[PDB]
Amino acid sequence: LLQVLKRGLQQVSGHGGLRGYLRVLFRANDVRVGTLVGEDKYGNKYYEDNKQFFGRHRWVIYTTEMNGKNTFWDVDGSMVPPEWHRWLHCMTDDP
Amino acid sequence: MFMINILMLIIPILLAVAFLTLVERKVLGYMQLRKGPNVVGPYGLLQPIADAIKLFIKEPLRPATSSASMFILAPIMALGLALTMWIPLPMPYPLINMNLGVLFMLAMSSLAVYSILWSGWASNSKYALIGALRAVAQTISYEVTLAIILLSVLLMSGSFTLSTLITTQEQMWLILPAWPLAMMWFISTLAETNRAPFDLTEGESELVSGFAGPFALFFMAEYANIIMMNIFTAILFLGTSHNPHMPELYTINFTIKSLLLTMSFLWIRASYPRFRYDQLMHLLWKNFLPLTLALCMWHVSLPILTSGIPPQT
Amino acid sequence: MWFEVLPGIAVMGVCLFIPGMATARIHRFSNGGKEKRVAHYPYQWYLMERDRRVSGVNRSYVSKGLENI
Amino acid sequence: TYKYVNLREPSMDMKSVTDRAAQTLLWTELIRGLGMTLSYLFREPATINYPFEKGPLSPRFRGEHALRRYPSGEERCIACKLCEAVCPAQAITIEAEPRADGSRRTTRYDIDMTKCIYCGFCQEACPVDAIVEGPNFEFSTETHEELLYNKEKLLNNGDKWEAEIAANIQADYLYR
Amino acid sequence: MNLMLALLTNFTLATLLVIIAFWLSARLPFSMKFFLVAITFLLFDLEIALLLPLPWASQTANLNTMLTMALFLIILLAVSLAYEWTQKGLEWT
Amino acid sequence: SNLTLNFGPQHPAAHGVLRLVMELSGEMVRKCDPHIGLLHRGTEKLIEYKTYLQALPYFDRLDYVSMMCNEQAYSLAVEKLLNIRPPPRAQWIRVLFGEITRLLNHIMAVTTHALDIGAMTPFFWMFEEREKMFEFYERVSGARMHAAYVRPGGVHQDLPLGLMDDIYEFSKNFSLRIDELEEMLTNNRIWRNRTVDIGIVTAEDALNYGFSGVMLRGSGIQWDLRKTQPYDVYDQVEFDVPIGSRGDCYDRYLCRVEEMRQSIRIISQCLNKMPPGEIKVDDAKVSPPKRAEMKTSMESLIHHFKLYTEGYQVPPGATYTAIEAPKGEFGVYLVSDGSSRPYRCKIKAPGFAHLAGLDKMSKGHMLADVVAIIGTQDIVFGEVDR
Amino acid sequence: GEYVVAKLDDLINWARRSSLWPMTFGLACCAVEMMHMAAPRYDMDRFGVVFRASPRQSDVMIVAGTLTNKMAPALRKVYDQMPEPRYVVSMGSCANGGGYYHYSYSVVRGCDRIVPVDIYVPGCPPTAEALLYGILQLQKKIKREKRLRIWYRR
Ligand SMILES: CCCCCCCCCCCCCCCCCC(=O)OC[C@H](COP(=O)(O)OCCN)OC(=O)CCCCCCCCCCCCCCCCC
Ligand SMILES: CCCCCCCCCCCCO[C@@H]1O[C@H](CO)[C@@H](O[C@H]2O[C@H](CO)[C@@H](O)[C@H](O)[C@H]2O)[C@H](O)[C@H]1O
Ligand SMILES: N=C(N)NC(=N)NCCc1ccc(I)c(Cl)c1
Ligand code: SF4
Ligand code: SF4
Ligand code: SF4
């Protein structure tokens, strides 16, 4: 139980402080830390954690601006470009 | 200072009711292998606020009641009586220390059904009145066992004062000597508050074809009654030791027991199918009532034959 | 995970903690730091009335001891 | 071969009778059900964080349609009208004529996306892999008219999604 | 004085919340059985009025008399239930 | 008096809307008059304007919980009029996905049966399993539900590499999931109070009213079309037919739960006995050739062109072909006039006769027992109304 | 005045879109994928979209399946009994424009002939994720509303 609490605190640091921790919590409603698989030209960031169960082992943190639109709060699934769309939906294994 | 005392009872009740809707949705979500609200506010903490505002700015049904005088009276009676049941609760000190507190709550709870009836008449529909008579017939039936079970427990307490239940359980919870009564008491409250598996008004309404702000007020009244039943159940059967110097120690332990009992209605709703209307009537008139009458006989005799008669004071 | 249900339970728990704690605190404030006197029967009311006279300020919860003998 | 699902005779020895009486009076079989829902409360939920997480799909997934090109940029479609012929919903409307260079190409290629059943028969019938159902499924609109695709819309879908469509075709064409 | 003020506050707030929420003769075919449920409730409720004094009745010197009359009343309650039961007053078919 | 049951529950439900006109006396049901047609879409007339391939997707949308089983029935009827035979690997795939589909249907049948009665938690546990089986549908066909995968001649495509291992992984853990479902319902006194001795139907009445499937086997009738009149490779797999003894809702509920266990038993054999080879009849006048052949061979291209425009012609004749669908006997009376479009296509939906028996089965029951009785028949108004 | 109205719309738009209680017409196939959106993988309840509601407590009607001429009057009546604000989501080809039964004598060629539609969700059936995308698209549509700004400028 002590190690469970430690993992919780490592997520705050894993998100570059409390401000970046609260940022993803209110943007994505999730504070998991993953491995940055890559980033596309629009600013979307792609993460993986194969320790998670299938369907949660890959995710994207959407960019805050895309094509002159403010997407800090307004994100949607159509913002993923086709090259990453294949990876995010597990149609392929290779990013 | 007494007005202030009234407010720090009323307002915390309505906030507790608002967030019970969140807790119910999330406890049921996880028992169903999902999450429940977790987007509107961190961990869904703003979901009750979003629902409250949504319901109040929602256009009313424009129903055209048959009695405007009594269309409005029903929700006022439901919510006014629900708040009234809290004033004699010793937590550990009651807002009003009533010598006959148990009778007061038994008497006030007997008036709850008037709101069910008055809404049926105000419905202006044959089917809504029939539904109101089935809810009333179920509620009053399960009031019979609650009154007798309550009396049987008071024969070991010796008073109608709710604080005496705390003294009665200084050395031991009443659940030990009276666990058979505790079981039927708990199920009677589920049936009394029309909760699953006894949620027949919600179910039979979902069948018959024909049968927002006012909905919200009715909802809060029902959920404030659920919390109060479980607080009363903890006081009645799981009495918390009271330290006069550290009174908030009693409140913490008492609150945890109430939450666990309230969370158990949620647990039960997640676990069982729904009774059929005649089947929950057979449950009371042919199972609980014969056993409650026999245990009422037992609990009158038991203190006498053991020389364990409690004092009046 | 299941522990994400606790924040909702904590808020509802604090909401149910305020009434019992508020009544106890206000009683101590209103009764000079003591429990509010309980008078259910005529005897207890008689002594509360007598204490009100004895105190000399019309306050039953002001207690007079051996210093008035 | 058969088996009986409910052909058991209860044992009437006093012990077994008392076992059933305890179940009735003490609700033991109801307590057991409460254990099962309790065990789920402490299990990890199956929910995924949409839209940040997505449901897994395969290269065969039949989503939004697109018209494809050769690597040169020439359109693959030659207005053969096999897709229009096979479409179970009559959702495709095609017209064609000789292009200014004499090429056999369409002047109209419409797909009523509110008639379509997303069955993929058109992409099976196409002899040149011109029409495909792409991987996009997040294209709901606010008006009916936006779901009546013409050739410009479908060609733009091909240019938009070709990077992923080509990869999906590469991963599945040996099963076709 | 305190109880009335508590009662006034509860119902005054209920009216206040209600007004915000709202603005800012023949024979019903309902069965005989449901009538006899209400009448059964009343008669049982009346016999429950008589049992309420029992927690005070147990302090009496005349315990033999009290206990006999306490069980006598509850047994008549049982016999009343037994009679409706055997006269098919509890059946819903 | 006179009531009308609502179109559907307040919670989300997928089986169609019913207009049930009820006669009651007190709590008792005196008459049930089902008014259907609220989902009648003229499927059978539409099929007459389609080629035999174009009509196949109409069958996914009948009992739209048992998609591939409906496809198999239509494919068997067409293959019988064509006088051809699908290849053995296709037959094994069709039985494999027939049993996967039976799991899909029985989960929907049993957990929505509990959900309507108010036992709602098992619904959520078991549609996570249905979600994983939707992934199997989408991996072979690209569609989660309406696959159009089984076709006259075999199956459209071969299993993707790695699919069978995943099906094995799912089947490994599934029996425990059925066990948890039974923990909530089987011995629950409330569930039994809602189901035992409800909607009793005698063996003779069941036959004369045209029942099939579990509606027959719940009354002790020893009939299963997979045993008596086997199709595809069902005569090469071992399984037991569950038989009820009391003919009521509870016995039919147990039959469906046991049928789920037998489906897992059959799936285990299909995974181990899957043979190699082609997936559609090697006969390019019925089944389209491979895309590589279509782009290299003159004969292949011609046959591709004709199969996808005119379609294949079916010799004139009429067949009634039926299978053991998850909901009972699902059949098609298919009439060919020698052309490439069916002349007539009557669909025998097992729920059509079952809902016609609701009035009989509900006599002398309570208003809430009608909920359980429509539940135990497992009605999808897509197949009832066509 | 101008500032308050802007922040006030922000509040009520937040409340209405964060608490979307749906009435689903499970007419046909598409209701199955609708159930899968309520199932644990997507858990529509976590967005505030409750499981069960009742027509007279609902904010959004989801027409999930084929609408026949026989069913058309009953669907319109439910829409007419919904308290406002009310939205309609057309789910799948049948409800969108008739779909695979478009040319049938007994099918309404699109539910938008009977009720006004806010969102059209394509597919036959749309995947549960596609429907969830459409529901979150409707939330964005509500987030764009400006009832008080328009009212204040009348
Ligand atoms: C030394 C001498 C001493 C003398 C005294 C000795 C006493 C001996 C007697 C001991 C046993 C008494 C048991 C009393 C408990 C009540 C029993 C009961 O009423 O259960 C029977 C009831 C009927 O069920 P059924 O299957 O239909 O039986 C056929 C009836 N014709 O079944 C039901 O109630 C069904 C209830 C369904 C709903 C339950 C759902 C919740 C279950 C978990 C709740 C756990 C309770 C938690 C308690 C919390 C308390 C704070
Ligand atoms: C928890 C307290 C929160 C208090 C917040 C106070 C903010 C007050 C702003 C109220 C804005 C209400 O906005 C408005 O509400 C009513 C019903 O509620 C809706 O309904 C109304 O409009 C429609 C057409 O527009 C009418 O046909 C209908 O008769 C009418 O009821 C409106 O469509 C909506 O635009
Ligand atoms: N979906 C349901 N109808 N049930 C439910 N959980 N309703 C909760 C809705 C509600 C009602 C009043 C208030 I005040 C608040 Cl805060 C929330
Ligand atoms: S997917 Fe099927 S229905 Fe849609 S356009 Fe292609 S052939 Fe026609
Ligand atoms: S898309 Fe393909 S099948 Fe359709 S007309 Fe063009 S080349 Fe022919
Ligand atoms: S759109 Fe497709 S899945 Fe939905 S009801 Fe129509 S045929 Fe069925």
CATH value at residue E20: 1.20.58.1610
Q: Which helix (H) or strand (E) holds D66?
A: strand D65-67
Q: D34–B33: do the CB atoms touch at under 8 Å?
A: no
Q: Which of B309, B166, B163 is nearest to B237 (CA)?
A: B166
Domain range enclosing C62: 1-69
* F291-329 per-residue burial string, b: 16 or more CB within 10 A, e: under 16: beebeeeeebeebbbbbbbebbbbeeeebebbbbbbbbb
Closest atom of ligand 3 relative to the B18 alpha carbon: 16
Spell out which residues of chain A touch residue B38, defining contact as CB-CB under 8 Å.
Answer: 29
Q: How far apart are CA F322 and CA F347, in angstroms?
A: 10
Phi/psi zone of residue G48: left (φ > 0), alpha (ψ -120 to 50 degrees), beta?
left
Bridge partners of F319?
A: F334
Residue for token pair 């000597």: B177
Q: Is the peptide bond before F122 cis (omega within 30 degrees of 0)?
A: no
Q: How far apart are CA F254 and CA E78, in angstroms?
A: 40
CA–CA distances in Å: residue B192 to residues A37, B144, D80, F194: 57, 10, 72, 21
**Residue G7, exposed/middle/buried by CB under 10 A (0-12, 13-18, 19+)?**
exposed
Strand-strand pairing, F2-5 and F19-25: antiparallel
Shortest distance between the Cα of E21 and any Cα of chain F, in A, equals 25
- Does G16 reach chain A within 8 Å, measured CB to CB? no
Q: Which residue of G has its CA nearest to A78?
A: G133
Return the residue whose CA atom lies nearest to atom 2 of ligand 2.
B53
Which 8-state DSSP code applies to residue A75? Answer: -
**Residue B53, exposed/middle/buried by CB under 10 A (0-12, 13-18, 19+)?**
middle
Spell out which residues of chain D touch residue A1, defining contact as CB-CB under 8 Å.
Answer: none
Three-class HEC string of B223-248 = HHHHHHHHHHHHHHHCCCCCCCCCHH
Residue for token pair 């469509």: D165
Q: Which of A36, A77, F145 is nearest to D48 (CA)?
A: A77
Q: D41–C2: do the CB atoms touch at under 8 Å?
A: yes
User: According to the annotation, is F270 in a ligand binding site?
Assistant: yes
Q: How far apart are CA F89 and CA F82, in angstroms?
A: 19
Q: Using CA of residue F200, residue F204, residue F210, residue F215, what is the dihedral sign?
A: positive
- Does D47 reach chain G within 8 Å, measured CB to CB? yes
Q: D171–A91: do the CB atoms touch at under 8 Å?
A: yes
Q: For residues E27 and E34, is the Cβ–Cβ distance under 8 A?
A: no
Mutation pick for ligand 4 pocket among D60, D84, D92, D109 (CB with most ligand atoms within 8 Å)? D92
What are the residue ranges of helices labelled H in D27-86? 28-41, 82-86
User: According to the annotation, is D72 in a ligand binding site?
Assistant: no
Q: How far apart are CA C43 and CA C36, in angstroms?
A: 17
Phi/psi zone of residue C33: left (φ > 0), alpha (ψ -120 to 50 degrees), beta?
left
What are the residue ranges of helices labelled H in F61-118? 67-82, 88-117
Domain range enclosing E82: 7-86
Q: Which of F371, F98, F83, F34 is nearest to F230 (CA)?
A: F98
CA–CA distances in Å: residue G62 to residues B55, F173, F311, G55, G67: 20, 35, 38, 11, 12
Q: How far apart are CA B293 and CA B280, in angstroms?
A: 18
Give the number of other Cβ atoms within 10 Å of residue A49's Cβ: 13
Q: How far apart are CA B101 and CA D104, in angstroms?
A: 93
Q: Which of B15, F228, D88 is nearest to C13 (CA)?
A: B15
Q: Which helix (H) or strand (E) holds D164?
A: helix D151-172
Chains F and D touch (3+ CB pairs under 8 A): yes
Bridge partners of F29?
A: F24
Q: How far apart are CA F150 and CA F90, in angstroms?
A: 9
What DSSP letter does each residue of chain B carry, written as one string? Answer: -HHHHHHHHHHHHHHHHHHHHHHHHHHHHHHTTS--S-SSSGGGTTHHHHHHHHHHTSPP-----S-HHHHHHHHHHHHHHHHHTTTT--SSS-SS--TTHHHHHHHHHTTTHHHHHHHHHHHT-HHHHHHHHHHHHHHHHHHHHHHHHHHHHHHHH--S-HHHHHHHTSSS-TTTTTHHHHHHHHHHHHHHTT-TTS-HHHHHHTTBS---HHHHHHHHHHHHHHHHHHHHHHHHHSPPP--SSSHHHHHHHHHHHHHHHHHHHHHHHTT--PPPHHHHHHHIIIIIHHHHHHHHHHHHHHHHHHT-PPP--
- Does D36 reach chain F within 8 Å, measured CB to CB? yes
Distance B291 CA to ligand 1 centre (A): 9
Which 8-state DSSP code applies to residue G115? Answer: S
Distance B132 CA to ligand 1 centre (A): 29
How many domains does the structure of chain C reveal? 1
Return the residue whose CA atom lies nearest to atom 3 of ligand 6.
G125
For G42, phi then psi, to 5°, come to -105, -35
Q: Which of B141, B83, B102, B120 is nearest to B205 (CA)?
A: B120
How many domains does the structure of chain E reveal? 1
Residues 6+ apart with CB under 8 A from F165: none
Q: How far apart are CA F153 and CA F82, in angstroms?
A: 9
Mutation pick for ligand 2 pocket among B57, B215, B217, B220 (CB with most ligand atoms within 8 Å)? B57
Shortest distance between the Cα of F105 and any Cα of chain E, in A, equals 35
Closest atom of ligand 6 relative to the G95 alpha carbon: 1
CA–CA distances in Å: residue B310 to residues B168, B307, D16, E59: 9, 9, 41, 8
Q: For residues F86 and F280, is the Cβ–Cβ distance under 8 A?
A: yes
Spell out which residues of chain B touch residue A73, defining contact as CB-CB under 8 Å.
Answer: none
User: According to the annotation, is G29 in a ligand binding site?
Assistant: yes
Q: Using CA of residue F281, residue F286, residue F291, residue F293, what is the dihedral sign?
A: positive
Q: How far apart are CA G108 and CA G113, in angstroms?
A: 8
Q: How far apart are CA F110 and CA F112, in angstroms?
A: 6
User: According to the annotation, is D14 in a ligand binding site?
Assistant: no
Strand-strand pairing, D2-4 and F241-243: parallel
E1 part of a folded domain: no
**Residue D63, exposed/middle/buried by CB under 10 A (0-12, 13-18, 19+)?**
buried
Shortest distance between the Cα of D12 and any Cα of chain A, in A, equals 50
E92 part of a folded domain: no
Among F19, F121, F249, pick the best mutation site for testing chain B contact (most B Cβ within 10 A). Answer: F121
Q: How far apart are CA E84 and CA E77, in angstroms?
A: 11
Q: For residues B275 and F371, is the Cβ–Cβ distance under 8 A?
A: no
Spell out which residues of chain E touch residue B281, defining contact as CB-CB under 8 Å.
Answer: 37, 90, 92
Residues G74-78: contacts with CB under 8 Å, at least 24 apart:
G74/F7, G74/F17, G74/F38, G75/G25, G75/G111, G75/G114, G75/G115, G76/G114, G76/G115, G78/G23, G78/G25
**Position F144: which residue type?**
R
Mutation pick for ligand 6 pocket among G25, G100, G104, G108 (CB with most ligand atoms within 8 Å)? G100
Q: Which residue of G has its CA nearest to A76?
A: G133
Q: How many helical (H) and strand (E) elements, i.e. helices and strands, does chain A have? A: 3, 5
B52 lines ligand 3 (CB under 6 A): yes
Q: How far apart are CA B261 and CA B232, in angstroms?
A: 10
User: According to the annotation, is D77 in a ligand binding site?
Assistant: yes
SS3 D46: coil
Q: How far apart are CA B128 and CA B135, in angstroms?
A: 11
**Position B113: which residue type?**
V
Could you say which ligand is closest to the alpha carbon of residue B272? 1
Final resolution, Å? 2.5
For G93, phi then psi, to 5°, come to -60, -40
Of F12, F16, F128, the CB nearest to G34: F12
Give the number of other Cβ atoms within 10 Å of residue F109's Cβ: 28
Q: How far apart are CA F59 and CA F61, in angstroms?
A: 5
